[PDB]
Amino acid sequence: AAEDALYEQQVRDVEAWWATPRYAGITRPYTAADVVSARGSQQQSYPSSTMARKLWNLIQERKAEGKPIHTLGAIDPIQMTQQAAHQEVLYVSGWACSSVLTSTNEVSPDFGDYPYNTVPNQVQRLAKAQSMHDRKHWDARRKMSAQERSSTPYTDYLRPIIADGDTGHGGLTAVTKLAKLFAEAGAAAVHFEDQMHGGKVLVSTGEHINRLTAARMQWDIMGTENLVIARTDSESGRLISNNIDARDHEFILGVTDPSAAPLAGTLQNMEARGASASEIDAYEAAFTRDHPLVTFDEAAVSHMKKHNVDPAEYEAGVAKDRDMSIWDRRALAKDILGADKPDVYWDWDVPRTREGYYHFRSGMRAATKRALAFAPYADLLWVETGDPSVSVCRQLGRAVKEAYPEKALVYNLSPSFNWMGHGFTEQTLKSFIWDIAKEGFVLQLVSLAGVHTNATATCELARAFKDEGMLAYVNLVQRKEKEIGCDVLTHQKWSGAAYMDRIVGAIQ
């Protein structure tokens, strides 16, 4: 039929699409029929998908060279226009949005607690400005001679946008709607982090995989090729919201002291009888001191050597199966111990927080494992590694390359770190970006760069303008703007006035 042919043609198309090199190694737990059944009859193309292909190709080219795509977080269209000739991509931060532009105009510290259309609205604001300045630029060039065009460098205002998706802002349907808004707004790529929606609390490995799968399916339904970026904060995240996933069990901490009674219960009982907030804090502090936390692997091997049993059989099994459940680990331990010896005591529930969070052994062991777990679901991997170290980066890069030799990584360049005070020289501060790009960190970003440049410039001017008036404005702004050749100096032309003049002249 008319509908049957269109359906069948799209199923064939989607299956072929997923077989292209763009999606080599990417796992999809759903089918092409699943996707086409959700599409309706109306096809639509999105500019973000052309930008996504531009970004994908740029990543492939720079990764092959061992070279960086390093950029600065931009908070407004002015910053976009001034980066366009220099940075090859544009980054949009949710931290920036939280304090400078929210969908409700209610700004706050970054808890990812703005309405979830906030960062997509900032993407749309930048993408529409990109299109305006590309149109102005194309109009300007058509007014030049053909040879003057060859003499003048082309400015590319259509740099692919990378945007912060936070944790996805709720359940899987929220993630699909957030991904939809981003593809509509213009984002070429979106990153999603393995923290709980609402210091840091991780979600299970499987929960985050499901978020990444939800974003991919929505873009598959839309027919767009936007890039999924998976971020993990398990290098520093000490709490996990959910113990259901066996791939996390080796990092969850528990007690070995059988005289420890569940902490959360004690704390609620205390609050019921009227105990002071400090008294609850004091007991919780003492409880952590009195009862040290270890992994079950650690408790088992300690129990075996204590009872004169070789742990090698256990250690081989957990090494062979990193993701062995706690249930199967206890089974393996008791067989090795046998009937005569007592069983390992270990309880991860007893020390849970008031919220019910479990304790988690953060570090690069957990972060590397999660990066590998996320790799078949993501186009780029973003691992927070702590303070900048070429050494740590090299280790992570090789660990990922040996399992997924084509996966590119992202690095978050800290704006606040004391580089010189922590071992760097001017030479090694300069080469850092290029040093880690050789190890596979292709996309690199100073998240809050546009916040800090803007704050510093206004701070300097505001103080001086109070006492020196227009002398301060000319010295600190007008003179400098002219010296460096900033094209906003002629603001009317910069804004596109000549472009609109021609259109109005054509209409009349």
Footprint (CB under 8 A) of its own copies, residues 97-126: 98-101, 105-111, 121, 124-125
> Does 470 engage in binding with its own copies (CB under 8 A)?
yes
Ligand-binding annotation for 431, yes or no, is no
Q: Residue 10 or 124: which CB sits closer to Mg ion? A: 124
Q: Provide the mask over 203-222, with x wherever binding to Mg ion is found by CB under 5 A and - wherever it is not.
A: --------------------
Sheet of strand 201-202: strand arrangement: 201-202, 239-240, 358-359
> Does 167 engage in binding with its own copies (CB under 8 A)?
no
Nearest alpha carbon to residue 359 among 348, 373, 370: 348
| Separation CA 233–CA 367 (nearest Å) | 7
Identify what 142 binds: its own copies, Mg ion, none; CB under 5 to 8 Å per kind.
Answer: none
Q: Provide the mask over 46-85, with x wherever binding to its own copies is found by CB under 8 A and - wherever it is not.
A: ----------------------x-x-x-xxxxxx-xxx-x
Ligand-binding annotation for 134, yes or no, is no
Token pair recorded at residue 266: 């004690």
Largest CA distance in the chain: 99
| Separation CA 138–CA 103 (nearest Å) | 32
> Does 250 engage in binding with Mg ion (CB under 5 A)?
no
> Does 164 engage in binding with Mg ion (CB under 5 A)?
yes
Nearest alpha carbon to residue 372 among 329, 436, 323: 323
> Does 480 engage in binding with its own copies (CB under 8 A)?
yes
Cβ–Cβ under 8 Å, residues 473 and 465 = yes
Q: Provide the mask over 90-129, with x wherever binding to Mg ion is found by CB under 5 A and - wherever it is not.
A: ----x-----------------------------------
Q: Residue 247 or 452: which CB sits closer to its own copies? A: 452
> Does 429 engage in binding with its own copies (CB under 8 A)?
yes
| Separation CA 194–CA 207 (nearest Å) | 8
Cα 7 → chain centroid: 35
Q: Residue 207 or 225: which CB sits closer to Mg ion? A: 207
DSSP string for residues in 92-128: E-HHHHHHH--TTS---SSSS-S-TTHHHHHHHHHHH
> Does 171 engage in binding with its own copies (CB under 8 A)?
no
Q: Of 155-163, 167-175, 304-312, 449-457, which part binds its own copies (CB under 8 A)?
A: 449-457
Q: Residue 164 or 384: which CB sits closer to Mg ion? A: 164
Q: Which of 49, 60, 395, 453 binds its own copies (CB under 8 A)?
A: 453
Token pair recorded at residue 314: 């256990």
Q: Residue 73 or 168: which CB sits closer to its own copies? A: 73
Sheet of strand 441-446: strand arrangement: 69-72, 441-446, 408-412, 380-383, 227-232, 189-193, 161-164, 90-92
| Separation CA 191–CA 193 (nearest Å) | 7
Q: Of 89-97, 228-236, 346-354, 365-373, which part binds Mg ion (CB under 5 A)?
A: 89-97
Binding site for Mg ion (CB under 5 A): 94, 164, 166
Annotated binding site for Mg(2+): 110, 164, 166
